[PDB]
Amino acid sequence: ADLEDNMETLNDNLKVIEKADNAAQVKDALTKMRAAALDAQKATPPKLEDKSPDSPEMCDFAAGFHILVGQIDDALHLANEGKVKEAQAAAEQLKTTCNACHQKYR
Ligand code: HEM
Ligand SMILES: CC(=O)Nc1cc2cccnc2c2ncccc12
Ligand code: NI
Ligand code: NI
Known part of the structure; x- marks a missing residue:
């Protein structure tokens, strides 16, 4: 996925956690966030285009x-x-x- 998607994923699931009721939902949210962060780490951000x-x-x-x-x-x-x-x-x-x-x- 591209940088923007990964950040949406990051953002959504942080809300999911804020809202969340029980352990399992929080665990699920964080696991998706983990995936996203790792994926975003691969991308070159626009502001670093030329570096x-x-x-x-x-x-x-x-x-x-x-x-x-x-x-x-x-x-x-x-x-x-x-x-x-x-x-x-x-x-x-x-x-x-x-x-x-x-x-x-x-
Ligand atoms: C869990 C914490 C984080 C949250 C809630 C978050 C949330 C967001 C949101 C809402 C955007 C706007 C996306 C858009 O413009 O379409 C964004 C973009 C961005 N984030 Fe994060 N982010 C997080 C962590 C990080 C970290 C740690 C980094 C750097 C290591 C980072 C780097 C960026 C960059 C470079 C953009 C620019 C998007 C673009 O130009 O395509 N983010 N993030
Ligand atoms: C020290 C460091 O940040 N290295 C890198 C940092 C990177 C940050 C975003 C995307 N790719 C890299 C990268 N790609 C290949 C090899 C090294 C890197
Ligand atoms: Ni990707
Ligand atoms: Ni790279």
């Missing part, structure tokens, strides 16, 4: 998603243990990683 894959920006862009997956994994651990409310808390905290990347490269 070499080796460039600090490209590397820092890729690194952004490595952080994000790391955090989704944190939330999945919780969701997995059925700790729904703090799974949601973990998911909230993702938002800072999203905005941080958006300020640089969106």
Whole structure:
């Protein structure tokens, strides 16, 4: 999928988690988000069109998603243990990683 799709996926399922009622729904949402983040990590964003894959920006862009997956994994651990409310808390905290990347490269 392309960068925009992956970000829609990211956005939707974060809402799904905010709304969500029980553990299984949160776990499902995060798993889709995981997939998306990993896919987005492959894409070259428009603002980095002309930069070499080796460039600090490209590397820092890729690194952004490595952080994000790391955090989704944190939330999945919780969701997995059925700790729904703090799974949601973990998911909230993702938002800072999203905005941080958006300020640089969106
Ligand atoms: C879970 C946290 C995140 C959320 C909720 C999120 C949400 C969004 C949304 C709503 C858009 C607008 C899409 C559009 O214009 O069609 C977007 C775009 C974008 N996001 Fe994220 N995002 C997240 C994480 C990240 C991270 C970590 C990065 C960098 C590593 C990133 C990089 C970008 C870029 C470069 C765009 C521009 C879209 C384009 O020009 O095609 N996002 N994101
Ligand atoms: C250090 C780093 O960020 N490398 C790369 C970062 C990348 C970020 C978006 C898309 N592709 C890459 C990429 N592709 C091939 C080889 C390396 C990279
Ligand atoms: Ni793709
Ligand atoms: Ni690449």
